[PDB]
Structures are given as C-alpha cells and as structure tokens.
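Page header: ASSEMBLY MODEL / two components / 838 residues total.
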Amino acid sequence: GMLKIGVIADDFTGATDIASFLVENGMPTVQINDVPTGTQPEGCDAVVISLKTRSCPAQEAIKQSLAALVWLKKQGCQQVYFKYCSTFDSTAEGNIGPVTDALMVALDTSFTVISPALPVNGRTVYQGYLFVMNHLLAESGMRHHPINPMTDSYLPRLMEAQAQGRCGVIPAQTLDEGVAATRAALSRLQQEGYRYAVLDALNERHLEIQGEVLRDAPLVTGGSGLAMGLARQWAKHGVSRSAGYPLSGRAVVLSGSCSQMTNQQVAFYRQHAPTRDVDVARCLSSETREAYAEALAQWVLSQDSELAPMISATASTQALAAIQQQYGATEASHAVEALFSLLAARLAEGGITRFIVAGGETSGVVTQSLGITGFHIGPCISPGVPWVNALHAPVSLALKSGNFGDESFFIRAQREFQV
Amino acid sequence: GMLKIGVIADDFTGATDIASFLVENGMPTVQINDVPTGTQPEGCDAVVISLKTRSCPAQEAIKQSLAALVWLKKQGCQQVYFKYCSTFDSTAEGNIGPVTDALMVALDTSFTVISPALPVNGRTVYQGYLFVMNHLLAESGMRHHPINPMTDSYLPRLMEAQAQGRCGVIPAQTLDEGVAATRAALSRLQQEGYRYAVLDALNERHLEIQGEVLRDAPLVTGGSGLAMGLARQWAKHGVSRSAGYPLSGRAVVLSGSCSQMTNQQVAFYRQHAPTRDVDVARCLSSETREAYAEALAQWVLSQDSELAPMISATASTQALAAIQQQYGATEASHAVEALFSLLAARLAEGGITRFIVAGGETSGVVTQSLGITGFHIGPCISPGVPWVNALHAPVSLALKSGNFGDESFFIRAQREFQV
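Prediction written out in full:
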C-alpha cells in the first residue's frame, strides 16, 4: 500500500489534530499510538504515529522518534513529517531541535523547514516571529506555561538554542511572490549554509503555497497547518474519511474531565439522557471497584433511551472545592480512572460499540482498557475531535480533551452521525 | 479594654471565618494580620490574630504562635483559642500538635480540647471520627488534598501522631446528657492522664453545650464551630458589628481570581456596571505597569454610574486555556498582581473608599498595598465574607476567596449595605 506522508507527532492530542486535518483535506489516515509493531494498516495514505516525546529527556525523544522512522521507512514512506506544537513548545534542552537533527541525519538530508503556523487557531508567523492571536508568543499566555514557558518569540533563536545548525526565514512577502520565488529563496538559504528555514504564514493561502513548494521534501516539520497544505496538493487530482465513520450499535458517554467546558457539557447532556454520577466512596478499593464497575455497566446496558447513558465523574471532580471553597476543580483521581478502566472493558463485552469520552487521562485509560492501539480517523464532531474506529476491535471512539467542544458536544456526537 | 477571647488562627481565610462567627453571635472583633505590633485596638471584645502557620515548618509555627500569645497576654486576654482548619489540615509533622503543646506549656495548662466540627458546613464529629458531609474524612475529597492529604479519620490518632500526649473523646451522647455530665467526663479524662480531648458535634446545639462547658477554659482549640458556642455564652446577658459596617464613598470591584464562581460573578456584574479587562500585554514591565495603573485608576475615577466599576483580570486568567484547550484556568500572574498593587494605592489616593476584591492573592496584595494591618469585622455579605473596616486608613474591604459567594455577590456587597 502507498504511504505518502508519515507523521511523527510529539503528543496525542496533536497527533489526532494533524490526522484530522489530513482527513478533512482528502487523505485517509490511521493514527497509531506508540511505535508501531505491526504492518502498514489498510485503508489509508497517511499514518500518524503518536509518541510522548514533547517533554521527556531528549535522548528518549530521539530514540522513540528514530524507532518510528525505522518503521515508516520499512513501510515505504515517501515523506516524513515531524509534528510538534504550534506554539513551539520546547525548552533549550529540546525536544524539537534534538529530534529534528536526528531525523535529518537518519534521512541523510541537510536542510529542512520549520512551519508552526495554524492561522485558523490564531497562530501566525511573520519574519520568523511567532504570534499567538494578536500578540507575540512571549507576550501571550505561553509566557508562563507550566512546563515550557516561552519568553522569546523569534523562532530561529528558539531553534538555534536547541539545535546544532543555523536557522533562516522565508518571509510572507516571498510566499506572496509564489512558488518559484519561494523555492529560489529556499535554495539560497541552503547554499548559504542554513540547516533549517522557518516559513511564514498569516493565512491559509500561505500554507497552500508551502504545501505546493514542499510536496517532495523528504522531511518537513511544523504543526498541523503545513499538513493541510500538503494534503491539498494531493487533493488536487481527486479525493473521496469513510473508514472512521462510526459503527452501528449502542453508545455510552464516559466523562472524567474536571474542566469548565466538560462541566457545561455534562450539565447540558444530563437533561436529555439517563445519567449516573460516579461515587468515590465506592472506588476506594479493588473489590469495591470491581463490583461497582459491574453494577454501572449493568446499569448502562439495561437503559433504554434514545441517547446514550452517561457516567460522569465531574461531580466528584468538584469535591475538594465543595468543602474548602478557596480551591476549584481537582482532576479525576487515580481511583476513578481505575473504575473507568474496568467499566469500559465490561461495556465493550456487553456490546457497547461507541464510546464518547471526555478527558485526556480518561481517553487514555479507556483506550488502553479496550486494548486499542490505533485507529482510522473519521469526521469531525468539533475541531480537534473526530470520530475514530479501532483497527482491531469493532469499536468507535470520540475522545475529547479538557476544553474542546461546545455545550452540546455529547448530543452532536450522536445526532449528527447516524447509520 | 477587656479582651475575652484571643484567637490564634493558622491562616487568613479561617481567621476571618472565625471572626465573622464571633461578630454574628454578638462579640465585636478585630482581626490583625501577623503578630501584632501595636496595642489592643479599641472597639472589640475578641481579637483574631492571623498567621501563615498551617503548612510552614513546625518551628516557625511554634515561634509565630508564641509571639502571638505573648502579645495577647500583654493585653490581658482571658481565653486563648487556637483556630485551625475544620478538616484538621495537618500532617504527622504538624502543625496542630506542635503548636497546641507549645501553647499549653506557655499557659502552664495540662489538658485542652480539640473541637473541629462546623455542622452548618458539613463537618461533624462522632466518637472522635471526623466526617465531611456524608463520609469519613479519609473517604472524602480531603483524601488527595494537594498539601495535606488526610488518609485517617480518627482525630485522636491524627493528633497523637503529631503531638506528645494521649488524646481522649467526649461522645455526642455525653453532650446530650448535658453540662454536668460533660464536665464530669472531661475531669475524668484528665485524671486518667489524657492531655487532650476531642469533642463530638453533630449539630449546633452540641456546640452550644461545649461553649457552655468551656466558658472559662484557659485554652481551647478547634475550628469556627466552638467559637460560635463560646460567643453565645457571652451573648446570654445581652449584645448590640457596627464598627465594621462599611463607610461612605465610592466603591470599586477588583477581580483577580480565576475560579468558576468568580467567573460567574464577573460575567454577571459586567452587565450592570462599567468594566474593564486587564490587558496582560500592558503589565509586562514596571514602566508599563505604572502608566497602566494610572490610566486604569483615572478610568475608574472618571466613571459615573450607580454601581462600582470593575477591573477584572479573569479574562487574562483564561488565556493559556484559549490557545491549548486541554488546559483550563491558570491563576493571576505575578505581573497582574503587581498591577493590582499599584492600582489599589492610586484608587485610595483618589478617594475610592470601598474595595470589593475577588481572589486570595489579590486580597493580599490589595491589603498590603493600602498598608492595612488589621480591621474591624462587620456584617456578612455571604458566608465567610464580611465587610471589614481598616483600623488606620478610612477604607472598607470585602475580600472574597476563590469559590465563596453567589452569582450576584458584587451587587449584593453594594445594594444590601447602603449608608
């Protein structure tokens, strides 16, 4: 099977964000979590491999990324795409520079591009400086980011602190001159000895131009924006997602997130569907968890309503705050995640087929519990949140993180996607 | 002046919670922050000294607490009350046990009570076990508390791990037999060699009985519930707060909290009063902060509306979340707090007289900025949140933490308190 783009992505939410852009722009795509062990899946032109390499030590990030590349090369991958965060989340110790230089050496290439922009979400790049909304990176929220605070907005400096070579810039104005101009400026940087080139983008046309220039680059790096541009080059001779359209069968909402938006979604949905709040006093041990998971699964399965029953832990998420009101939310405890783990397996055994899950940890535990390793990426319910179909279990997932989605997410997930 | 109860409180929000219960039950009360340096203030029968001794090292907690006691004794304090948290927030290293034993030695006393209950907020104690709502401490949210996770609910064990002596229990049923019975059981514990006695309470009557039994104990320890009971003993021959009724003059709402409820309060209030959102890109340096504080003060002062203008930082509090939607709130940055600091001083210089402040850090910085050291505790706006009047500046404050209050707090603060 032909594998056109192989994405190595530094996290899970962004793996699925880029995969969704490829599918929305005509390229069928499977996401596999962790370095793949199998064989290229059927039914896709892109594979997005998801790693946990954004913040771990550089060496672990290099090793995981090279393992991913060995696999992609084995499947005949035509282009490799290193996907990192749109706000260039890294420190002077990595992991964008160290992984990029490693991939370049493994692919025996001397020049690559860096393209973080995603204008539709307010990330733009001008003269090489990254903007979050209407302000420079370093004058935005990112400035006090908990893990990787970003106190400089100039991408070539951010890159050079972290990487071995010199980094150049292709400004918006060159892109505006077009393909020939942009390709000339790229060559010129390379003749001058730059290893890397940051690429400007203020709007989706700029990304389309980059896509057109870089159709055949062996390696390319960036956020999701450039992928969109590359996808539309392949869309250009014809398209027609299907493979990740959700399956038939009963659905369940499993909510573990503590967030403002998840709270709104649970408050809304619970007026429309039978729901049940996870009691923490029944999760405090194994035996109790095991029995409670059974009871809750039997509860879900014995419902008979149009919309999917909900099991929400978001009330429990609000308990520290209920007593000392100086605190707010606290994220779902290990004991509640352990419960969701057991619950998901049993729901699957009892024939639940569609799982609408709120929370990044909860999505993780549900996926790992059903033993799902990868999936076909389907249509969007909301930006960043597509329906997905497991590769080797007949199960469909819609995994939502933190504050993604709108109020009616849990309804739309169902109502706008029937058969 | 007669000083009946001297409270040494291990934090700020609880200092003001206990002070409010004394005032609501007839005992005029000043709160002083940090060990007092002055002379007993006029116009009160209780003084609540607020320390930051809940989580610091035991030795710092002992030293601060003894300094507080030296002062209270100098003013002729008749009873000392060690106020800690109702959920007994501590670890095996302190600070409840170490401070209690120290106070006992300084007061040359051999027996004291421990009374955490506050039933109206769902803290009850039965047979010495602490309950948060309908569950034991250790099966409630407190179990994974960030600073002091509580994995045992039996107060005498919690106390003994932390303290030098043996700890007994007076059960609800004895309280139900009354004063004579309760006082007999207390003596009996003491003859048996216990240093301390935990006291049950399921309801406010139990607290009233304790208050009646312990009117003349030299030292007493607990949360706010027992204070209520002691206050009503002194209420018994007549009462009639006034001193902390808010002053005349223009008001301002200063909102720094990132919380769910603060968000609701800001969203609500901003439809009723002129408001202005703090722009973080104008707080990133001194000079900019200084000028921005000026501009914002001039803005507030030049308004002309019935209700107080608001300066809210809660939009800025939501910026990390706006970009990577996996995150939620982030608490107000140092640069925003630095701004509020300058802003408060200028508002005071320009004649603002009433400050309605949302956020614990923000309350801190506003208070420190106006150089307020203590205040007369006035009436409640909401539970835990009274109007307060500075002792040495003609300024009135209503300081609200995190998720205290209801939706209309910022209106009620003004509308239910006129002259």
